[PDB]
Amino acid sequence: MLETPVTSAPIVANYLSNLPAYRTGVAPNLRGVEIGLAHGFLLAGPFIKLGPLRNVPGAAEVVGCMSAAGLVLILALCLSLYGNAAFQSTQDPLMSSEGWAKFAGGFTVGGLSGVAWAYVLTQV
Amino acid sequence: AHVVKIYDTCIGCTQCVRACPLDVLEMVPWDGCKAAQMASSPRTEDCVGCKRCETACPTDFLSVRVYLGNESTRSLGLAY
Amino acid sequence: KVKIAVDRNPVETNFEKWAKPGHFSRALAKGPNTTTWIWNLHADAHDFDNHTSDLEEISRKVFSAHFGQLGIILIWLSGMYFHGARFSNYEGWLSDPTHIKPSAQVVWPIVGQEILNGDVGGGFQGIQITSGFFQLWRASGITSELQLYSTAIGGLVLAAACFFAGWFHYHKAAPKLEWFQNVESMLNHHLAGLLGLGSLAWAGHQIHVSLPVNKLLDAGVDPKEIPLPHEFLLNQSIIADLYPSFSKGLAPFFTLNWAEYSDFLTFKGGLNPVTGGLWLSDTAHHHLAIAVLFLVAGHQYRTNWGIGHSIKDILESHKGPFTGNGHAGLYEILTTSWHAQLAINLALFGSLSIIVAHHMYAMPPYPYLATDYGTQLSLFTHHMWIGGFCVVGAGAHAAIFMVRDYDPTNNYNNLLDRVIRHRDAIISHLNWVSIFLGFHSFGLYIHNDTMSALGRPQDMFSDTAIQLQPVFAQWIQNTHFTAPQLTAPNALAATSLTWGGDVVAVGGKVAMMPIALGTSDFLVHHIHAFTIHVTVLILLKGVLFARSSRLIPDKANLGFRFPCDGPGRGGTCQVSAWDHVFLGLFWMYNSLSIVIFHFSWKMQSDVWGTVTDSGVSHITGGNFAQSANTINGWLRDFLWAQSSQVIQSYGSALSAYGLMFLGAHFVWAFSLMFLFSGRGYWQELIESIVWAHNKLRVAPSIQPRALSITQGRAVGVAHYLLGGIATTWSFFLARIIAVG
Amino acid sequence: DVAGLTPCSESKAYNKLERKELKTLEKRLKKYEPGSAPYLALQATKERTQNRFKNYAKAGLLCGNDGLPHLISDPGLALRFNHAGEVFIPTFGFLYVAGYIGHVGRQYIIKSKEDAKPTDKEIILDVPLALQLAFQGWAWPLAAIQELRNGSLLEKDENITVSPR
Amino acid sequence: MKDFTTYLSTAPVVGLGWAIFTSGLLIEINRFFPDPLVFSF
Amino acid sequence: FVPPAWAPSLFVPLTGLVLPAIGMAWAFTYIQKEK
Amino acid sequence: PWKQPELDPDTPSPIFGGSTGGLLRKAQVEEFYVTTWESPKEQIFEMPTGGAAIMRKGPNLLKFARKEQCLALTTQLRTKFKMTPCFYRVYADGKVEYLHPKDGVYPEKVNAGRVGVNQNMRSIGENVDPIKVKFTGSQPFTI
Amino acid sequence: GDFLVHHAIALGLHTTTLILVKGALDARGSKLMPDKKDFGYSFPCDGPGRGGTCDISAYDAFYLAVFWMLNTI
Ligand code: CLA
Ligand code: CLA
Ligand code: CLA
Ligand code: CLA
Ligand SMILES: CC1=C(/C=C/C(C)=C/C=C/C(C)=C\C=C\C=C(C)\C=C\C=C(C)\C=C\C2=C(C)CCCC2(C)C)C(C)(C)CCC1
Ligand SMILES: CC1=C(C/C=C(\C)CCC[C@H](C)CCC[C@H](C)CCCC(C)C)C(=O)c2ccccc2C1=O
Ligand code: SF4
């Protein structure tokens, strides 16, 4: 109820409007793909930096990439669990059960694609 | 929700209803007391079990008793 | 407009109310029937807001109580001076301050406690004092015990005068409410007279008395052969020989040629190499400048002569567009509510005490103060704890003001109303900040401990593996080391030795030296910030949710100090603002305990020690760079490596520290039964004891009852704080006296 | 020579402990001139230590393997080895004093209840009455057993406040 | 006088008087009988 | 009889990662199971 | 009272800014409570969900998420200004329930029209032991 | 020293016994709560009324006796 200049800013409003979570202009698969790509690309960062094999060149990036892929898979499993255990009962298709399942599938597809993209960028 | 039970030792002093912060008790006509009033709980589903009515009871032991159990959204005092 | 308003004899000095214990409140006026009355007698004694609804009587009681506390303080100071006059070796300490320990408390040989009178040196036996009173008296020019005797007698006389003044200003001539409400006159007189005039008087004492005595003491002459301060005051030849500018005789002051005063009003920032303290000329010019600034500031507010500033006009004028009524109703709040002023005074007093502790360990403003490691450690810890207690009492009395003296009519769209209106966002953001700080500090410590126990020293957050150096603190240290070089060219050296430079030592013991900052220092500083943030969150949640909340909408009607609202809504135990302060007291204790542990370890490892030809050999050998990064390092290299002096102190003069350590452990453990448990168990136990005494017909007329839940929480937190404080006190003092 | 222990006078560790204490007291004493108050204080401490060590010996006290005296608590065994003055006589004396306290408190509780507002007398003590009961408690066991005999010491279970079952 | 006497007749004041009396008695006994342990006449 | 040498390399990650993960998944579905 | 009043959503809210402890998502998922009163003049009162507001000269309507907040506001208005307000409960589907003045005379009175329910006609302490009522689902105080 | 620590053990055992038998004997009723049988074995309190009634169930007596047992062992 308490409106604030930062919450009601038009720049903030249009920045949150075109986000994949609040766009409401596409299938949940595309939003999940974008979410997985972005979050996997950022999550690969701390893993290629400070892992136990960070002193060993070459293998550090590979180990961090598989750790990021495992974290992405764990997040996808928790997303699927939340979708199955949250929307099991009675206009946005994301809030639906199978819509959230498709969102989770897009999320894991985007996560592995972003992990592979981060591996390519670190190799180059 | 919780269970509010009122016994015949009540003197109809209306202190429990004034101490109630959720409007659970009420005063009904009676003949077993000098004040001709008896406490009732027609809205026990809204009681949270705060035991504020028991503090205001002037009689020895308690003429009104609150027993907790089977908490709900109204009984847990949740605004969410 | 501003004038003295005094009623003549409103209260008669009669002992008829001393016979009745419960008289200030109508609840206790009926007499006692249970034992919880007695505690209620000792709990609502100073609750003057509950005794009467009249602000004038409350203000008169506050004035009288302040006079009584000043009388008590002056009695304590006079007793300290008397103990220094008679049962002390101050004259022996003046001959050789680097070899005779300061002692001012002597015990009576009764049951074997005469072993506590240790060999402090100078042919004296007593307890090694850590108050630093010897260094304060040396900084004040006190030489003989006659001056200490005169100071003690004057302190007793002024204490009696203040005690009679309290009696007079309450019973005989009681000021009215309009007299107390003149905040502009109070501020002007306090800035100009209480602070500025006292600063000028102390500056004049330093110029005319303390500086020549300190200069002659640093010259190495006999203190008995030092001329008396009145000889410096009257005869100008000695003061001209010691300082040629005194030969002018007040000429440069009234001719604006103040540079001629540069010989005895210096700017040589740093430590005196002769004594390891601050330069007395620097302190003289400092107190003179402070006096000038405060006399300037004391002519700011308008009282009776047209010119000046109006506090209400200033507060109402400072209103922005993002705040609505900016500082609108605060003038009426602070002129009618004693508790808001109490919160402000306690917060600023505690913060200033913390500042005093930090800037006193940094610059020792006393001759032969830094050499006495125990005095510096005790003073830092004492001011630290007093500041913490004051800043938690600030939150307590702010919550009391929120419950009692808050009026929604005067606060519609002002700043207090908007703070209440977004208190949930405030508490949520503070909770997130506290959680993030605790994670990225304590989890870092746990990470270091795990990777140490897993045999991965390269995976640790240490000074050798992962360099999380404090680049901002190091940059500030480097900039302040170059402060006399470019930005303050009139200073002879740096303002303190902590920024950098060389090592100043007195008598073979290091007085001050540069302090290096590493990853462990960053970790403990962020830990301290986290603990302060959590305590701030607790006290702010107590203050802002004191009136109402989503859980309890009518918390204001329940009062400030209530135990609970029953087990309803899942349970409302410890929901009051008083319980919030009771919870935050432990967090303040934990924060300040970690702070003083960091101070003691850091100054024992990287500051204190001895100075030989090879270099500076510290007390602990500088293990803080390699041991402070893990919890096990504090467990072993700080708590187990030290505290061996406390446990081996038996049979020596330090054995009282070990006994006090054991008693403090006992009180800390005994507090937990009041912190845990409840009231019904002890009530039924008391019922069984009542049956036992009724069998023998020895049941008291006053019915024994268990302590109240609020009372039990208060007893638990008080015994817990006392036990922890005395444990740290005994451990610190024994360790710093035996090896220091 | 009970419990496999030796008397303090016959023991060697007792004399060794006394010698060590005298040695450290003399080491503390040697740092002060004889014409100083700490010298007289340490001399008085040494004299008190010597007097205490002499009084602990030749008094029946015995120590085992450490020179620290031991106390025998069983009556009869302490009676036939002159160890009754260790704990047996002090426990009787403490029982006498504790009965004095209990009798004085009982007399003040009973004697301040037959008046209006007994809690006022409980909170503001009748000092002459308290002193009179203080000086009248020298025969506490006689009055206690007499109150037991006449039944006024104990209350019946009908007038006693009792918790529900 | 009688009001001050009743103030002195209050429980903390008489407890304080008992405290000084008992403490002084025990301290003087310990001083004039230095460190006894066993009752030996 | 004697387990192979790779048994600590397989059973420990199974009962430390996989088995607790499937247990928490089953428990989470059981907690939020609605009619 | 004689006739149960019907709430009006078009009644003006009291003059107030933004509240942080206001209605949460439960207001659009579960029931929420609405308090109405009749102010003869404009004055400043203190809400239980935040700071202070100003009521309008006329009907005044406020919304809360808890019945305890509604009764706290009701008793504050009755003790401070003798306002006699009344609050309804509105569910997610729009069902309106009359809550505080069930007979319109407030529960402090009697009105000789309320039937006392949940009243045990035996004295407290005369209830049977829990061993007497075992494996039956009936509590000793529920008989 | 063995004698003193044995008496400490006796103190711990007797105190834990005191707490546990006070919880068991006053389980179904007491003067502060005559109807303690109707509230079950593990109930929090009766509220702040009658001076305060927290930790009045026999479960709370057991939970304090756990602390005392831990100290004794
Ligand atoms: C420049 C004049 C002056 C001075 C020096 C003071 C000094 C003081 N005031 Mg005061 N005040 C003044 C004017 C002054 N006041 C005016 C004009 C008003 C009315 C608007 C007040 C209203 C006021 C209140 C309401 C309170 C004080 C209090 C205090 C004390 C603060 C505690 C402290 O710092 O301890 C410093 C202590 C010392 C330095 C020890 C020596 C103290 C000596 C005896 C005081 C001498 C100064 C005195 C004002 C001279 C006039 C009195 C004369 C008739 C004998 C302090 C003694 C507090 C208090 O009650 O404390 C008792 C308090 O609550 N002041
Ligand atoms: C509060 C602080 C303070 C005090 C008390 C003093 C006091 C003194 N200083 Mg110092 N001084 C100070 C601050 C202070 N100064 C500061 C800040 C500086 C700046 C660097 C100096 C720099 C300085 C220098 C360089 C020298 C002094 C000197 C002096 C003396 C000369 C006094 C004088 O002529 O002043 C003016 C004094 C008066 C006008 C007297 C006041 C009026 C009297 C009291 C009226 C009495 C009337 C009364 C009713 C009648 C008597 C009553 C009786 C019959 C019962 C004096 C002892 C000089 C010195 O020691 O040589 C003697 C000297 O060389 N001082
Ligand atoms: C500037 C100083 C100052 C002043 C003037 C006040 C004034 C007041 N406070 Mg505040 N307070 C302060 C500082 C101050 N406080 C600080 C620093 C804290 C934090 C510790 C608090 C915490 C606090 C709370 C939590 C409460 C108050 C309350 C009160 C009121 C009554 C106090 C009372 O009756 O106590 C009477 C005196 C006592 C109860 C004695 C206390 C003794 C303590 C517990 C133990 C002392 C230990 C001692 C150091 C060592 C003993 C060892 C032993 C072996 C002898 C009064 C308005 C109360 C109130 O109702 O406010 C309106 C209240 O609830 N204050
Ligand atoms: C050492 C014991 C301990 C710990 C860990 C905590 C932890 C916490 N308390 Mg505290 N508290 C304690 C004792 C402790 N408390 C005591 C004794 C009291 C009584 C005075 C309180 C009183 C108290 C109050 C009054 C408040 C807290 C708050 C908090 C929270 C602050 C979060 C934070 O900054 O750190 C983050 C948490 C940690 C660093 C925990 C350390 C454990 C590791 C490092 C985390 C990861 C573990 C592991 C890797 C994951 C395992 C996964 C799986 C196997 C389980 C957090 C939950 C505040 C709150 O609610 O939040 C702001 C608050 O208001 N507590
Ligand atoms: C010899 C001896 C011993 C032993 C002992 C014994 C064995 C005992 C027993 C005992 C017993 C077995 C007892 C019983 C009892 C019972 C009862 C039942 C009681 C009662 C009591 C009473 C009742 C009291 C009272 C009182 C009071 C408290 C107060 C007032 C006074 C009077 C006294 C009255 C020993 C070795 C240890 C030590 C040494 C010595
Ligand atoms: C133990 C305990 C009690 C019982 C404690 C009581 C009744 C207080 C007892 C105080 C005593 C009477 C103080 C005086 C003790 C001595 C008799 C005085 C000193 C004697 C020597 C000088 C000889 C509570 O009432 C309680 C309430 C709420 C939370 C926790 C607890 C709690 O833990
Ligand atoms: S009585 Fe005790 S346990 Fe019960 S709500 Fe109050 S504080 Fe909590």
Numbering used by the authors:
A (entry chain L): 56 to 145, 160 to 193
B (entry chain C): 2 to 81
C (entry chain A): 12 to 751
D (entry chain F): 63 to 227
E (entry chain J): 1 to 41
F (entry chain I): 15 to 49
G (entry chain D): 51 to 193
H (entry chain B): 516 to 588
The authors write:
Multisubunit Photosystem I (PSI) encompasses half of this Fe in its three Fe4S4 centers and is a target for degradation in insufficient Fe conditions, which reduces the capacity for CO2 fixation. TIDI1 (thylakoid iron deficiency induced) is an iron starvation induced chlorophyll-binding protein found in multiple green algae including Dunaliella spp. isolated from coastal Arctic waters and hypersaline ponds. PSI and PSII are each associated with LHC proteins for increased absorption cross-section, LHCA for PSI and LHCB (or LHCBM) for PSII. In this work, we report high-resolution cryoelectron microscopy (cryo-EM) structures of PSI-LHCI supercomplexes from Fe-starved compared to Fe-replete cells of both D. salina and D. tertiolecta.
Cryo-EM analysis of the PSI-LHCI supercomplexes from Fe-starved cells revealed major populations (~60% and 30% for D. salina and D. tertiolecta, respectively) distinct from the PSI-LHCI1 structures found in the Fe-replete cells. The resulting structures (hereafter named PSI–LHCI2) reached overall resolutions of 2.9 Å for D. salina and 2.7 Å for D. tertiolecta. The PSI–LHCI2 supercomplexes have an additional crescent-shaped LHCI tetramer with associated pigments that is evident in both Dunaliella spp. grown in Fe-starved conditions. The larger size of the DsPSI–LHCI2 supercomplex versus the DtPSI–LHCI2 supercomplex in the biochemical preparations can be explained, in part, by the presence of PSAG1, PSAH1, PSAO1, and the LHCA2-LHCA9 dimer in the DsPSI–LHCI2 supercomplex, but not the DtPSI–LHCI2 supercomplex. The biochemical preparations from Fe-starved D. tertiolecta cells contained a minor population of PSI-LHCI1 supercomplexes (~20%, resolved to 3.1 Å) containing PSAG1, LHCA2, and LHCA9, indicating that the absence of these subunits in the DtPSI–LHCI2 complex is not trivially explained by dissociation during sample preparation or vitrification. In terms of pigments and cofactors, we identified D. salina and D. tertiolecta PSI–LHCI2 supercomplexes to contain, respectively, 218 and 185 Chl a, 23 and 20 Chl b, 59 and 47 Car, 56 and 26 lipids, plus 3 Fe4S4, 1 Chl a’, and 2 phylloquinones in the reaction center. We could not confidently model Chl a302, Chl a305, and a carotenoid in PSAL1 of the DtPSI–LHCI2 supercomplex due to poor density in those regions. The outer LHCI tetramer of the Dunaliella spp. PSI–LHCI2 supercomplexes is rotated toward PSAK1 by ~33 degrees, whereas in other reported green algal structures, the outer LHCI tetramer is aligned with the inner LHCI tetramer. We modeled three Cars in TIDI1 in the same location as those in LHCA3 in both structures, and 13 Chls in D. salina and 12 in D. tertiolecta. Chl a611 in D. tertiolecta could not be modeled because of poor density in that region.
